[PDB]
Symmetry: none
Amino acid sequence: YGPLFEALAHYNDKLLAMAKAQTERTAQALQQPWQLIQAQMNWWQDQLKLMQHTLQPIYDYLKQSYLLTARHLLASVDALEGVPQKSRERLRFFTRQYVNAMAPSNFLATNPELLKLGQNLVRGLALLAEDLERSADQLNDESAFELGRDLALTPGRVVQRTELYELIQYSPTTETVGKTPVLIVPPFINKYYIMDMRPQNSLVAWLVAQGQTVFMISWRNPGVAQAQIDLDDYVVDGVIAALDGVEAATGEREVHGIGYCIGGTALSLAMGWLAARRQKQRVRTATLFTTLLDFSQPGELGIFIHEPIIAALEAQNEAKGIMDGRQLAVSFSLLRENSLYWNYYIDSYLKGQSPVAFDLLHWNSDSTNVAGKTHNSLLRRLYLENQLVKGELKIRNTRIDLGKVKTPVLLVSAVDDHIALWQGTWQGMKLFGGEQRFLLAESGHIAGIINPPAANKYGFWHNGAEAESPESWLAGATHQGGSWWPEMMGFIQNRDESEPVPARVPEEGLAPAPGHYVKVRLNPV
Amino acid sequence: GPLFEALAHYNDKLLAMAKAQTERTAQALLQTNLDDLQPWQLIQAQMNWWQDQLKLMQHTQPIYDYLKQSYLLTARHLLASVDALEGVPQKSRERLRFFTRQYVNAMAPSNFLATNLALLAEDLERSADQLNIFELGRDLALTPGRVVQRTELYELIQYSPTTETVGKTPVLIVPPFINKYYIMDMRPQNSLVAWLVAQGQTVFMISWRNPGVAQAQIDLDDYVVDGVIAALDGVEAATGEREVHGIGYCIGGTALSLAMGWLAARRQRVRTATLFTTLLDFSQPGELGIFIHEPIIAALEAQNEAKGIMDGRQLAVSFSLLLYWNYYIDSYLKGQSPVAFDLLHWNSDSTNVAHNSLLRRLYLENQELKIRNTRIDLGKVKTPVLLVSAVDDHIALWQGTWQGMKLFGGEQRFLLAESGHIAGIINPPAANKYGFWHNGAESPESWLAGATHQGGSWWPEMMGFIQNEPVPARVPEEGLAPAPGHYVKVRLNP
Amino acid sequence: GPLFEALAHYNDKLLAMAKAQTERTAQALLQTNLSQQPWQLIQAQMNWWQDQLKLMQHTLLKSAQPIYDYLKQSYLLTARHLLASVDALEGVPQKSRERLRFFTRQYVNAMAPSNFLATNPELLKLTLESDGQNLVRGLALLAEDLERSADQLNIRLTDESAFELGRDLALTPGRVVQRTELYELIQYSPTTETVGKTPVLIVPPFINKYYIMDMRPQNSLVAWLVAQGQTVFMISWRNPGVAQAQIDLDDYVVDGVIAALDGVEAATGEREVHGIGYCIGGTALSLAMGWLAARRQKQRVRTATLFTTLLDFSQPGELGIFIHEPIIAALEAQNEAKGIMDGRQLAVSFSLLRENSLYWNYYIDSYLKGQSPVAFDLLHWNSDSTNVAGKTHNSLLRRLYLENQLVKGELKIRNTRIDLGKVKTPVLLVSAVDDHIALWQGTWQGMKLFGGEQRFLLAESGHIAGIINPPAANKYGFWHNGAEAESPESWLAGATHQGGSWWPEMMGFIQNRDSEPVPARVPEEGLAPAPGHYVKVRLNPVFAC
């Protein structure tokens, strides 16, 4: 009631400064036009002023509000006349993507009718699923983005290709690198290049610039041929087999592990599997981004965790062979940042960059399938039964006890995370039997994790002392502005300290940097 | 709550039209020879915005949440509108962009001086000009007829009859000279001229010339004697009748009132007098009272005498004579071409005015009035008078028109239309869209308190007012030109 | 020697017909107090064939002035043929004579190679490096002269054809369940108590009308498929006018074939059908399967049988005379100017009916079988020309015939690259050995493009006779080979010949890839009766609605 007016004025001043800057650059000579953003900023201010004026009358506001959207339509299209049609079509496609992404009814997890809704609930769930998927198909233009050119362009080589993954080894870009390599295990629900989007916000590029040999697992988009691949296979044949692949290319049997969402869960299970069978420690440090080990707080995804629903999904998976990612794309959204338009479209434009919200929407729509047996194990053994905390989880007939893991773990979570609640991630940290550290990012599931140091856009909470509850941890935590990536880099290099080793140049391998598994789309472009 | 119900009524009316269009395209596939060759989705995009926004308001930082969701509805409205225009030809889309920009500006209070001085006008005048960078006789003003007389000030149009018998007494219409006359002759469905002819009435029409610099010294007095009285002599020359039924609109009715007084004061032709939104008492000038001040009128009087005439493009920026639901949405759901397009085209087809007498002698002095050195006394007029005013009138407040009715010395009746300055007047009986208030008993507020609503058009009530011996239908003479004439086609911006 | 024996066999069958006609006329006199051409007319023709052959043998033995002697006696044989023909038509009503005069004139002009641009000797000279751009005008002059003679011949006609669609041809009962801009979907009423679950959808070529597959009840493929317990759907393309000038090959694939598939589901509830395509209709069916596969859409075509379908245009046959850059560019300008490709212009360019035995097997033989001469029905279909959209023809000339984009993987249907290797639908290609439009070796090369099961059949006749061979006919044969070959010649070398019709082999190909029989689907009332309205629109009309 007031701060909105002041904050809106601040954004208008930055656009006016950018408008003057664009005129000065045009003077030296003698993308979206600033008039298009001005058309939107004019709507936000006038609507707030009209609302303040109001603070038959309902109709008067409706008529006056309808006049403001009409002014918004006329000013926007007028700005798009000098823009070429191909670039303009890109803007129309992404705006259609963004406008449907912000509708809670468009996703089952946030759908009102599903919340309103035994067998009758299961039958109605299928009705909501088929309608949303049909709407997505008709909406889903082409030539949006090409991997290796616009996204996932960090130089490297594919040093190994298995049934489940392609192992990417990135170019060093430094004269010296650390002895212990870095292995990143991305989630197999979406594609990995969220950590390798663009050079300014690519986590892979930043880790490489810090003198570290970075390896990235690139999971295959599973087809019907991978119907029997289970969670056990992704742990043993996925993560551990990648560890053997890193040793085969660098000669180091010990690496720094990094995991994201369910990828960190697989990394945790791999460390528990090696520990339970008394194998020499192959993971020196383990950084886990928004990883869920205790599934007691599933968040909005708990609407699906019910015996009739899970039993129905298990039958569907076994019938179709795999879980169709296009069905998962309407089930929930991994990208739900608060004020995506303000912080990643308006702010990203005023920084001279191509709108980051465009890249985020393309990654969110680059859905991937899940193996039939894997999804079921993930639904039942982890989300429903919560075997990992109860010590009942078995990976290839090996009971997993994370207390047997002595690898120092660093859990980096996000306060506004809607997929992996930070409190839930905090409880799973105590499961480990070694050093434990916790970090709490300021933004959401995606924005709070991909915050490069240069952006200086958010912050984090750190606390070295132990607490008995997440609320107690945060109460004693100290806030630090900026990115937490240097803190993670300090967490890795303060425990290996090892003499620097000459930069490992990747071998030619089988394929160029991005690989082939990441380019396989469910809806081909 | 009732708003939701009215929206549901429109949505069902749009769905019925959509089914009718699908059936017509299916029948079109049957009749398609080899040798020869707005979408409802666009209106559906509009109805989707109106209903969903009302739902969002009913649901209601908290303010930011409403703003973000409201911006999402505007985004759907923009995307659905552009997608609805996929098959529309680019030329047709430019028409939609042109008229929607006119409606946006026309409903913007800052774009008009009265709803927002010369410096502010010059900037506003430029904004209209930079924006600038229907055909009369075909789309508007297409009622058949002939120009029986053309003078310096007007063209007299006599329309061809559509009935075998017409009334003996002809009808003469005196339009306002601030805008063009064809608002009373839009299209056959909403043409008052066509309706009067169908009622067995010979109709004559004055078509005022768009005044140039050559008419700098033409005064209001000339429009009374050389305009209205001279037209009466022209009607007698074409029909042999010295007595006509008078109809006036806005300032045209004021001139007719002064014309009746001028013949009465000099003891010398008007059977009935119907006056639409006619102002005789200027005590309630409305929003135009901002200009009625001694320093402002004195400044304008010097400018008008210097330039000769006041540019109508400047008058169009001073105030607006001009709706979305009843003349664009409703007109579209009735199968018609959007009437709101014609009204916007007429409002922007402004005409010049020579005017100082109107500012000072009428608005300021509110006369004591003398027309050609002849004192005006409306009490000397015994002609039955009918005042038709509008509740939502922003130019001529209906209370001011009611008080001025008492100036006449004969029968007086008052009618109050249910819409604005123009919409409540141009309401044909076939439309069945508005209503009126009537009260047979004799303050303006006291009349309305005792008035009864009836609904429908007031044209049959006006036709009953006039008609309360049939003559063979008068076929108009060849005259000088066909129906629309030449004076009405003179545009300030070609 | 063998020729004399064949004539004797026909002459003996003619004698039996004479006895049948005398008994038929004798019984007709009994039914009193209130068609078939006379056998003497056919006998008059057989007398010419035998006498001309005898004269040929006598003069060839005389060789082992003489040239004039054979010419003089042949002119005497032509004179006897004229007198015997007119005398045979003594009792025949005038209309029948005009009917026979019309069909004899049609057959005579159809068998003259100079009457068609593709087989015209004059155009062949201008093609052999004897022109470049002047060929355009050299082609345009030959086109206008051939078209002019057709126009003068047609304009003299004052009566409509003896055949009416829905009464004489295309009379299989059914309903029009859907009508779009491009097609009318016909669902035929069942003749069996039970039908198969998977319906059958036929995609006809859009160069001529569809009812070649539904001519007469004895030789109607549609009726035969229906009698085999199959719910049969038929696409009936609109005869495109100037209003369809911008319709492209892409639209016929998506808005034509795919939209019809949605129409079949709307009428039967089945998202998967058995596809059948003919000539360019099979090309559209192939492109429809590739389009659904390239976009990773659920497979909607269970089996695909393709009649004389061209996917590789490397061997265009006699139609290659037009496949040259100056000619195709010139034709593209005419189609953009006129809006559509005039089917009456296409009728003089090439002939879809070029069977080596139209007179003997489909006029003489069909007459001795008691039938109305089938050659009459074939000549009506061939002369029932249809237009082609300007954009569709161009794409067909350049994107397929000239550039051969489908093989080179350059073809895109609505900005979707087509790769037939992504199609896993089992395909059965049925081609004809004597085909002059789609050479069987060219149709064989396109078979390997598919990524699923592939089968090939080679019928023992031409483009039309070898395809519309009813089992009941017991005419011609076909070659089948289950093994994979590296060349068309290798396929035929290992192929086994079987006599009779190949239609059961196609029915076996369909029924071995399918469920449980469902009660017979009675078609909904729909929009119109069986034949529909699109097929009745003729380019050259006499009378009017």
